[PDB]
Design a protein around this motif. Structure first.
Motif, PDB file in Angstrom:
ATOM      1  N   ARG A  19       8.848   0.441  -8.709  1.00 28.47           N
ATOM      2  CA  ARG A  19       8.963   1.416  -7.210  1.00 28.47           C
ATOM      3  C   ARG A  19      10.706   1.741  -6.946  1.00 28.47           C
ATOM      4  O   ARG A  19      10.712   0.242  -7.150  1.00 28.47           O
ATOM      5  N   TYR A  36       9.915  -8.652   5.914  1.00 28.85           N
ATOM      6  CA  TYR A  36       9.903  -7.197   7.160  1.00 28.85           C
ATOM      7  C   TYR A  36       9.519  -7.841   8.192  1.00 28.85           C
ATOM      8  O   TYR A  36       8.870  -8.621   8.959  1.00 28.85           O
ATOM      9  N   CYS A  57      -0.077   0.423   5.597  1.00 27.14           N
ATOM     10  CA  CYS A  57      -0.583  -0.598   6.590  1.00 27.14           C
ATOM     11  C   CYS A  57      -0.879   0.480   7.637  1.00 27.14           C
ATOM     12  O   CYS A  57      -2.439   0.331   8.239  1.00 27.14           O
ATOM     13  N   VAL A  81      10.884  -4.668   0.328  1.00 28.83           N
ATOM     14  CA  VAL A  81       9.838  -4.325   0.111  1.00 28.83           C
ATOM     15  C   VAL A  81       9.915  -2.361   0.614  1.00 28.83           C
ATOM     16  O   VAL A  81       9.009  -1.751   1.073  1.00 28.83           O
ATOM     17  N   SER A  82      11.189  -2.237   1.274  1.00 29.52           N
ATOM     18  CA  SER A  82      11.961  -1.514   2.104  1.00 29.52           C
ATOM     19  C   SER A  82      11.977  -0.185   1.188  1.00 29.52           C
ATOM     20  O   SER A  82      12.357   0.201   0.552  1.00 29.52           O
ATOM     21  N   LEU A  83      12.518   0.704   2.138  1.00 30.81           N
ATOM     22  CA  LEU A  83      12.674   1.831   1.573  1.00 30.81           C
ATOM     23  C   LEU A  83      14.064   2.448   1.851  1.00 30.81           C
ATOM     24  O   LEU A  83      14.623   2.795   3.616  1.00 30.81           O
ATOM     25  N   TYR A 132       0.893   5.529   3.971  1.00 29.63           N
ATOM     26  CA  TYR A 132       0.942   3.700   3.828  1.00 29.63           C
ATOM     27  C   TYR A 132       0.095   2.865   3.879  1.00 29.63           C
ATOM     28  O   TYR A 132      -0.621   3.626   4.266  1.00 29.63           O
ATOM     29  N   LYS A 141      13.506   3.795   7.529  1.00 25.66           N
ATOM     30  CA  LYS A 141      14.105   4.009   6.350  1.00 25.66           C
ATOM     31  C   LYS A 141      15.172   4.771   6.240  1.00 25.66           C
ATOM     32  O   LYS A 141      16.196   5.182   6.906  1.00 25.66           O
ATOM     33  N   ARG A 163       8.889  -6.041  10.654  1.00 25.38           N
ATOM     34  CA  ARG A 163       7.478  -5.893  11.734  1.00 25.38           C
ATOM     35  C   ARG A 163       6.705  -7.373  12.175  1.00 25.38           C
ATOM     36  O   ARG A 163       5.684  -7.356  12.998  1.00 25.38           O
ATOM     37  N   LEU A 164       6.806  -7.716  10.247  1.00 21.80           N
ATOM     38  CA  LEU A 164       5.798  -8.496  10.345  1.00 21.80           C
ATOM     39  C   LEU A 164       6.092 -10.243  11.256  1.00 21.80           C
ATOM     40  O   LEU A 164       5.626 -10.745  11.619  1.00 21.80           O
TER      41      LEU A 164
HETATM   42  C1  LIG Z   1       3.856  -4.493   5.247  1.00 20.18           C
HETATM   43  C2  LIG Z   1       5.688  -4.410   3.887  1.00 20.18           C
HETATM   44  C3  LIG Z   1       6.819  -3.017   4.754  1.00 20.18           C
HETATM   45  C4  LIG Z   1       6.306  -2.413   3.291  1.00 20.18           C
HETATM   46  C5  LIG Z   1       7.773  -1.219   3.145  1.00 20.18           C
HETATM   47  N1  LIG Z   1       7.361  -0.205   4.579  1.00 20.18           N
HETATM   48  C6  LIG Z   1       7.320  -0.650   2.653  1.00 20.18           C
HETATM   49  O1  LIG Z   1       6.263   0.193   1.984  1.00 20.18           O
HETATM   50  O2  LIG Z   1       8.652   0.642   1.898  1.00 20.18           O
END
Ligand SMILES: CCCC[C@H](N)C(=O)O
Ligand SMILES: CCCC[C@H](N)C(=O)O
Ligand SMILES: CCCC[C@H](N)C(=O)O
Ligand SMILES: CCCC[C@H](N)C(=O)O
Lengths: 396, 396, 396, 396
Positions: D373, C57, D114, D337-339, D112, D209, C59-60
């Motif tokens: 998810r 991702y 983070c 892992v994004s959406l 979330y 997103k 940001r990382l």
């Molecule tokens: C730290 C990875 C990013 C997680 C992602 N932002 C999500 O929950 O959709």
């Protein structure tokens, strides 16, 4: 003041550009738009008439691209500029604007390959005939001229051996016989050579090379009289090639050209050092570089060019196999076919781009089995020399 | 699986694209490069041969642009795609690839203005002759065909009155007489019309309009057989027009086309509502829209098009002065000459783009003094209708 | 080979970069993505563990930004780099990673204004106390150290009078008392000064200035030990500031840094000429430039810096009114508050950025009424000198 | 007119934007600049004072980013907006602006990850304490409030089971006890939920997103009162986080948000169909989606949200092994892992992102071994359903 009054480095930085009028933004905004909006029916009509000035649609013109066009016009000492999708499009937009069926062109033989393909195969199919000559011999240009000749076309320096063409002399010949002189100034950039100042009518560049300088833009530019450029824009580009430049590409090219002066100085300082190294190497049979006194047209080069350029060609002992071994042995120079980037690029036409071409037909083209072309970048010259010495030693 | 097996919306999103092989990056990387590097002399030779595949130089091909080309080939159900610097370049690269001096083209009269200029003035100067006909009458196409005819060229729907052309019928006529059919599908996009499925040989778009959809890219695309596309690429683009697309532009177009399906649905849903409003307005003399049953070729439209489109033309009572007042009275619709953007755009050709053209010569072109063209955007249709009603009421 | 073995110019061009593995694209691709895709559940787990390497991702981490981080690590001779949204974010991500309530910082007083605001007002509100000292006097640094001191923070050269700080000496003091030394190297760039080589632990830059050099990117970078950088990335950036750099910004910065060497050479060559002109001008009371022998810390400058820099400050006769007249009289230099661009920028803090600040409180800060700051660009020095001479003559 | 008067779709397209004043360019220009130039010393002083308006430096403000900020303020019905480098930076810039050592925050536990890390580990180290509660139970929020509580922080819907929080009710509780309510509206976008209209004081988004929607931008936005936003900008962003947004990123986000309305409609139409399919599948134990009547807070959802969203979570029979098999068996959905992208994304936290987390500690977090998810994209729902059915059938 007027941008045409400052020193050349100052012009490189400032010409064609100013802070944004609405916001003061220093960088030229990227006007990445297709559409432009009118305040009234009248305003739209005025612009279209075309009584009045302003923008309409990016294919026709754009504020970002306009800045680039104005800058390069200043740098080449021409009236107006026109940006294009590629160097090729700069050349073909120009020639297809000037010529029609029944017309004739006298062209140098020693020209960019794709340009040669256009002139050799495409032009004649549109009824436009082309005579190829050795442009290093101005008398051959004169002898090839016909009543139908509209254009004389030349590159200097020229691939693959960096031979030269006497622009001022050729301009005089072309003009006496009623033709225009078009010069491809890609290899030198306006920092090193100014064909318009020597009598040429139109200059074209692939900005893909030194003008952009960063190996991330395909683009071209045409510079010439306002009357011609207007035709190239409103007929050649608008109707014929459709080869417009993206505003983003113009913005990148504006960004790249900011460092043109300092880049060319370093390219050429590096190339001269490397050229001298190669000339001293017992495994290298020939070195082609305008900065070496042994160059056939050295004095012409000194009068016509402010610097000898960043490009070098040379022949390695042992022909084709040696050339292949050499390029496969470099660790720093990169194998690729472009030039004028910040990285040093190397290529061996006989084994890479002309492998299927008849050995004897390549020789005719001036491409020998051991010929290597080098585009010298901004690295430490000592590192490039060490890489070359390493690869040459291995190959021979 | 194979991208050609999924539903059309799925294809819109996925076709031609996949995660980056090196990194897994989901978005297609922007390969904003001119140069490509070879691992060895042999690899460079292989690619060049052109025995083998891979990249060489962005004018010839590029990973970002390739994704776009493959996507549009899928969407049009054609074999291969070729991206260009502009819609115009798509058209001229195509025709200049296919035709040479002595060849002939039969073209619709009701075509994009700049295309008309190319066909009317530029083509004949290259010895390529063009006959213009009313393509709504397939018999006129047949009657104009000559032994030298290589191409029949049509747009549908066509400006300025959104008349139609029967693609399947014209394809049959062209093919029987040994010609290719080229269709400009810009107005509909592949979501609404698929000329190749109806017998056309080649489809061209200005992606500047609906395919990109965001009013920030000038570009074109050509879709057709692999054998033809290869010629358009390695001769037409490489040698003749030089009209290549910037990787950044291809990336933006890929981004824009992601929403093509949902955009077209909304454009057309909005346009139908606005068209019906206009048809009910006593101050509006005519409304030209394929979605109205009163349209001369309504049934043809229903068979050939999946949706009636986002473009509407109409005539306001009171001719030129009324038209000028109306466009000067809108508060939401924007005065501009492009179409297929997310914003509603409006223009009044008689007072804006054709003010100097002879009134009687415009009438011949189908441009009446009260004709307004509207590109319906993604706003609430109620707001657009209110703006139109406000401006119309004032103007009349 | 290994990029850390080549000459500095070679590193500037090549370090951290290589042709794209999938395609051979020479330019670093712009990986303008948020999302990265995994091949399997296992691959996703591996990366996350974080047992294994690869992307997840933006940001990382991101391939484009990684190249920039690796390049700057090489140029500063540090282990690892971390790019940020701004110079400020580089500084605060660093300090907020290192410090927590109850901790203490010893900082130079002569620092960037916004940095001062963070240290003066924001840090104490988080329970982190800061003592400001004159860092040109290393004994004041020592005297201010407490058991709780985690960090000593310095800039050199420092605004507004370009005073210096002895990095090696301060490093020794900080380390003996168990603290880290953080140095803001923005003014010099790695081409002119290398704090890590002199004992500093962490270096920060606003790449907005010389590293990018083209006045079109806001960004920062942090360079230091891998162990620290990992914490700055996975805690400081990820959790605290969220100050990640856009891949496009990283790509532009990579592009800009290609010319860092040749830019710094010209900036400094130009600045020295202008500094000498100013020192010879009877209307100029003082000139602050590390390249003039009269500079209080001249010899320190010669040992610590490879070039004297591109920034000059000077005081014009007649105080505030003279300073205002002067800056309002320049025609080439541009009035603006940034530095390290290709254009020459000028500012007069007393009338422009500190007009409301108490005259006597400015004097304390070292900002006199006649103080002008000049960021020397890439124009012809003769043109800049002429513009300055013109404006000075008018103002006095 | 005034942009706040039009329909929501119209606002989505137009709010915050207008044609460029200098040129009429329809697309918002990309003001990719760091520096802004002043016309005089006085103009620079005015802007800085800050008596007067205009731009100074991109970290402080920028024309492109301003357009985005104004648009989102309109869409959320708030006074002002502030763009940031990331969603995380939006959250931390907000909270670090509002809180200082000794202050207290009441936060939902279901947030979330983070964000949780920041609140759990980073905040306390700055002397700012946080109490976590089940925000689905408003009484727990009340019970946790202290004299020192400055902020109540919530997300709705919340991961991983899409539970809801009653914004209006929580706002009332927070306000009675003198605290601000901050709501993360990322999951819904302003098209589906408007927390400010329900009493919240501040809204934050990761525009990464749905707002951007195209999976190619990391960014955040904060919307709230002018008085607060000014502090977030001139202290929080300027001094503390430095988390400014790149103008290019703002431009892309402006471009993406143009289609927000039509994207959300399709996302949610698709998700409802898929949710119903999953609920009918005997191999699926649970389906979490606000659009299903079985959802614990269904009626609250209907009052608070205009659409049920594009996100679905569900549990597959057979726990962890089944979940791993399932995600490894999809052919269309992408593992990531994004959406909120145009592509359908899928993830299985137990085997992918939480593999090392204690099985019993995950269960506490609401993450069961079989929990999947799904971020539903713009593909044909039939294709997504077929892919899911295929993978589920294989996995079980
Ligand atoms: C730290 C990875 C990013 C997680 C992602 N932002 C999500 O929950 O959709
Ligand atoms: C057709 C490949 C490009 C050749 C390249 N333009 C060069 O001569 O440098
Ligand atoms: C030459 C101006 C462009 C006209 C525009 N392409 C349109 O017809 O929509
Ligand atoms: C806060 C305005 C920016 C000041 C600028 N960064 C400079 O000192 O050059």
């Amino acid at each position: 003041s007027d941008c045409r009054t400052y020193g050349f480095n100052t012009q490189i930085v400032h010409a064609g550009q100013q802070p944004d009028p609405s916001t003061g933004a220093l960088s030229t905004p990227i006007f990445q738009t297709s559409t432009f909006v009118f305040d009234s029916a009248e305003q739209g009509a005025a612009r279209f008439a075309l009584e009045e000035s302003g923008y309409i649609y990016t294919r026709l013109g754009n504020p970002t691209t306009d800045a680039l066009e104005k800058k390069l016009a200043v740098l080449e000492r021409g009236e107006a500029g026109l940006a294009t999708a590629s160097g090729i499009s700069a050349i073909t937009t120009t020639l297809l604007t000037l010529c029609q069926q029944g017309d004739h062109i006298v062209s140098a033989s020693a020209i960019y390959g794709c340009t040669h393909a256009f002139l050799s195969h495409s032009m004649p199919k549109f009824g436009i005939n082309v005579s190829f000559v050795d442009a290093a011999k101005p008398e051959e240009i004169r002898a090839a001229m016909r009543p139908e000749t509209k254009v004389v076309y030349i590159e200097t320096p020229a691939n693959p051996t960096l031979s030269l063409v006497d622009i001022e002399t050729v301009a005089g010949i072309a003009h006496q016989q009623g033709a225009l002189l078009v010069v491809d100034n890609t290899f030198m950039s306006p920092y090193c050579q100014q064909p318009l100042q020597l009598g040429a009518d139109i200059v074209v560049h692939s900005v893909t090379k030194y003008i952009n300088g960063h190996g991330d833009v395909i683009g071209g530019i045409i510079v010439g009289k306002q009357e011609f450029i207007d035709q190239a824009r409103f007929v050649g580009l608008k109707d014929i090639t459709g080869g417009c430049m993206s505003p983003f590409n113009a913005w990148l090219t504006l960004r790249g050209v900011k460092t043109l002066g300092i880049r060319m100085e370093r390219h050429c300082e590096n190339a001269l050092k490397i050229a001298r190294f190669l000339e001293g190497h017992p495994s290298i049979t020939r070195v082609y570089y305008p900065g070496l006194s042994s160059h056939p047209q050295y004095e012409l080069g000194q009068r016509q060019m402010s610097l000898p350029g960043g490009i070098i060609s040379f022949e390695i002992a042992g022909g084709l196999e040696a050339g292949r071994r050499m390029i496969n042995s470099v660790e720093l120079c990169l194998l690729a076919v472009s030039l004028g980037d910040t990285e040093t690029l190397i290529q061996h036409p006989a084994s890479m781009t002309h492998s299927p071409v008849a050995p004897e037909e390549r020789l005719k083209a001036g491409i020998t089995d051991g010929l290597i072309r080098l585009s010298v970048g901004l690295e430490d010259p000592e590192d490039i020399i060490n890489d070359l010495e390493h690869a040459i030693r291995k190959a021979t």
